[PDB]
Write a protein that binds this ligand. Sequence first.
Ligand SMILES: Nc1nc2c(nc(Br)n2CCN(/C=C/P(=O)(O)O)CCO/C=C/P(=O)(O)O)c(=O)[nH]1
Ligand SMILES: Nc1nc2c(nc(Br)n2CCN(/C=C/P(=O)(O)O)CCO/C=C/P(=O)(O)O)c(=O)[nH]1
Ligand SMILES: Nc1nc2c(nc(Br)n2CCN(/C=C/P(=O)(O)O)CCO/C=C/P(=O)(O)O)c(=O)[nH]1
Ligand SMILES: Nc1nc2c(nc(Br)n2CCN(/C=C/P(=O)(O)O)CCO/C=C/P(=O)(O)O)c(=O)[nH]1
Ligand SMILES: [Mg+2]
Ligand SMILES: [Mg+2]
Ligand SMILES: [Mg+2]
Ligand SMILES: [Mg+2]
Ligand SMILES: [Mg+2]
Ligand SMILES: [Mg+2]
Lengths: 203, 197, 202, 201
Amino acid sequence: PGVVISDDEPGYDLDLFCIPNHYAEDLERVFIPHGLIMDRTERLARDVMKEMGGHHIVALCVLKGGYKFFADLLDYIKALNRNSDRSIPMTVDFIRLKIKVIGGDDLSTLTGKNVLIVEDIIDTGKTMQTLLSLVRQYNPKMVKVASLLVKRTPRSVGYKPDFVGFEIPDKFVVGYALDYNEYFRDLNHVCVISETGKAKYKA
Amino acid sequence: PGVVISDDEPGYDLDLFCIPNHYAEDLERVFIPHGLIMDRTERLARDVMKEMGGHHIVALCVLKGGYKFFADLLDYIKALNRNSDRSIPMTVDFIRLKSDDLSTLTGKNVLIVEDIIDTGKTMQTLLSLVRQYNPKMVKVASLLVKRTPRSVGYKPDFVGFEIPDKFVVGYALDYNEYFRDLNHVCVISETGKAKYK
Amino acid sequence: SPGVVISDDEPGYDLDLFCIPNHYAEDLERVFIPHGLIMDRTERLARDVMKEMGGHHIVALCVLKGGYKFFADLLDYIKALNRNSDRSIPMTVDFIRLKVIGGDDLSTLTGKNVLIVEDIIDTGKTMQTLLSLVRQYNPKMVKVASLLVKRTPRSVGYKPDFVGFEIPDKFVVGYALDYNEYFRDLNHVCVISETGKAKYKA
Amino acid sequence: SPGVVISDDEPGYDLDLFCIPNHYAEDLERVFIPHGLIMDRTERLARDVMKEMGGHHIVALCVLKGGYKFFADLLDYIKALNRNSDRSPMTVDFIRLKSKVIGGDDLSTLTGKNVLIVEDIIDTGKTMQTLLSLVRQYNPKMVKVASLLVKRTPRSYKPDFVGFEIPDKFVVGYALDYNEYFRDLNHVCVISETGKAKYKA
Ligand SMILES: Nc1nc2c(nc(Br)n2CCN(/C=C/P(=O)(O)O)CCO/C=C/P(=O)(O)O)c(=O)[nH]1
Ligand SMILES: Nc1nc2c(nc(Br)n2CCN(/C=C/P(=O)(O)O)CCO/C=C/P(=O)(O)O)c(=O)[nH]1
Ligand SMILES: Nc1nc2c(nc(Br)n2CCN(/C=C/P(=O)(O)O)CCO/C=C/P(=O)(O)O)c(=O)[nH]1
Ligand SMILES: Nc1nc2c(nc(Br)n2CCN(/C=C/P(=O)(O)O)CCO/C=C/P(=O)(O)O)c(=O)[nH]1
Ligand SMILES: [Mg+2]
Ligand SMILES: [Mg+2]
Ligand SMILES: [Mg+2]
Ligand SMILES: [Mg+2]
Ligand SMILES: [Mg+2]
Ligand SMILES: [Mg+2]
């Protein structure tokens, strides 16, 4: 169930960290520091290789929010593979969701393969429910899902990923590729958005 | 202009580096070490911000091969922006070229991030499409640029390495979808060249 | 700024959530400060340091042994600032043990911005002593960066100029902090189990 | 393994292609070994060390000051291996050499241990041949030397782990110094003539 961040977690003062100046007024607190995300991701990579390392893996990135987690998770997986006795090749693909998948290879590349789906965040779990359905029709050897964040919410349809970075409360977070109206993707920490930031970048 | 790698560059013995096990007999030499790419990319990030830091930047990744260079270049740019501030907001988008609405590019500093440029036709093609939507500025960063008389003449704005006319893999560059899961840029061996075809 | 405040009742992190050196699996209780969190805090400290000390040649003094990890990473962040900024300053380094053992002649400190880098402040007596010696070599300025500062009644009231984390009165190991020379080979700051405390007991 | 062989006619890289401290901008001639390349080689050396020296307790011995960076990074890669694999324990010590051994714990700590000596550079090999000659009479289980650099020169010894074999050029950076300067530099570089004059003692 990953690293549990409780509802009462204050987070960290912005001034205790290096923060891009253009977002200085737009953030309330640092919620999950970049380095903590790395540490957690290093362990997740090992759990992935343990469960899925026996056969060729197709890593599927869910753009856009998933791009940072995906890149770093794969870098840790690569670090394992070039310092071990045994490994399996990995292929990568990228998709965007619209219950319609856009971009990416013909999903026949997934049959017979060990498919790892990489998301930034699970909320109600409906987005993942639909995607898994589309994927399992192509009869892959195995489908697992890694999500950096899983929200505790009375709206979850019951779905839970196989790999979870952090279990967080239902707050709106940004950073580490997670966005608010396309903003805050260029931020290494996961942070909570300020009220003024929310008004300034509102559409 | 970038780091010039000559035609006679021997590259490195694989045994001198950490190489993923499943590619051990599929590679011949390490051509550009992962860390050398990182060092070059750090300098490129600074060059990008000197040129494009005056206004909102849309970073445009050309999938799939550009994804690694893209992620690392942006990491270095972000390091600059949080440690010398003095900074500019940046948005990102991703596109694949098959041989978001491009109105989002209007009035912005667009940086196209590419893995490799050979003839330069792909980039010229992409640029002609982008410029229809009137960005304030378009620049292209390419990790690799091949030395070849087959070049149509197009020169990108930011170049990591100028390399000879060799087929290279690694750092997200593929051979029939293989070798993307490799941190070094390397040259493929004959054994590997006939196993993944 | 007292740095990042870790309260008395911070439970820390379950070991199974992180990559832990296998030979220390039973020897640790909880992860207290993850390595990455140390890195992020250290990055800001590096900027804080240059802001105050970047006007003149800096001599960075590492207090061995426990200070070596924090020292290496802090300097790495400082160097990152120095090669990506319009202007910068030369930095020289030296290493001392406190019993002052080793190190160059302290006349090398004369006229320089001296940065003392420590792993942990407890009572503050070690630093007060060192500071009162260093001043007699007339540095341009002298500052102390400590990764950790303990909340203790035992404090003589010395506070360093740069602090990573303010922690409760617990014994911690990792990130070069040792328990009888063990646990220096650990990237996280952690709390030692009863099993490991007896197993590595002198 | 003689390590990564850098040939005598190695031109190095233009400084302008890399991020370099402005205070050294006129003091360096060329970048010789980029920091990232050092990392890549060190990663592999870490696996080589652990294959040969694991598993018994390893005492890692850093030869200050030049060795401190290579020491810190080599040990970081070793620790990455120790926390992402099956089975692996190290203690560290730091020594300085007087032209004797200064600082350090009493070398009785080395007895019955796997001792890894970590150095920045080997020239004549005298410094280390003399050091090994001392360490051994404390009867360690084994003693190995990892050196970042070995120069091609008249040499009265061969280390067990080598990062790079370099020509007979004076190099600085990555903790390697010229009269205490250039330690605050991530790349290994060749010193310019103005840099020699400027920081001359
Ligand atoms: N940055 C950020 N985004 C959040 C957050 N929560 C949700 Br839902 N989202 C949005 C996720 N949604 C993105 C659609 P759009 O906003 O039009 O680009 C869908 C992602 O998939 C998970 C949602 P679900 O499990 O189906 O309820 C959050 O806390 N932070
Ligand atoms: N990995 C690798 N690929 C190379 C290389 N050279 C070319 Br051309 N390519 C092919 C680039 N192409 C790969 C398409 P796909 O078959 O789906 O993977 C993409 C376009 O690149 C731009 C070449 P151009 O400047 O227009 O001549 C190379 O050295 N290494
Ligand atoms: N690993 C660890 N060590 C701690 C801790 N607290 C102290 Br005090 N120490 C010991 C610090 N001391 C160990 C030296 P020695 O035992 O003689 O080799 C060094 C000096 O630290 C400064 C304490 P002070 O501020 O003068 O009260 C701790 O929480 N963790
Ligand atoms: N930075 C740098 N230094 C070099 C170099 N070559 C030598 Br010799 N040295 C000098 C190393 N020596 C002088 C240090 P100090 O007493 O502080 O002046 C230190 C030990 O290195 C071993 C040399 P050796 O193998 O015994 O000939 C070099 O290429 N670069
Ligand atoms: Mg999502
Ligand atoms: Mg969104
Ligand atoms: Mg391309
Ligand atoms: Mg101490
Ligand atoms: Mg101690
Ligand atoms: Mg030496």
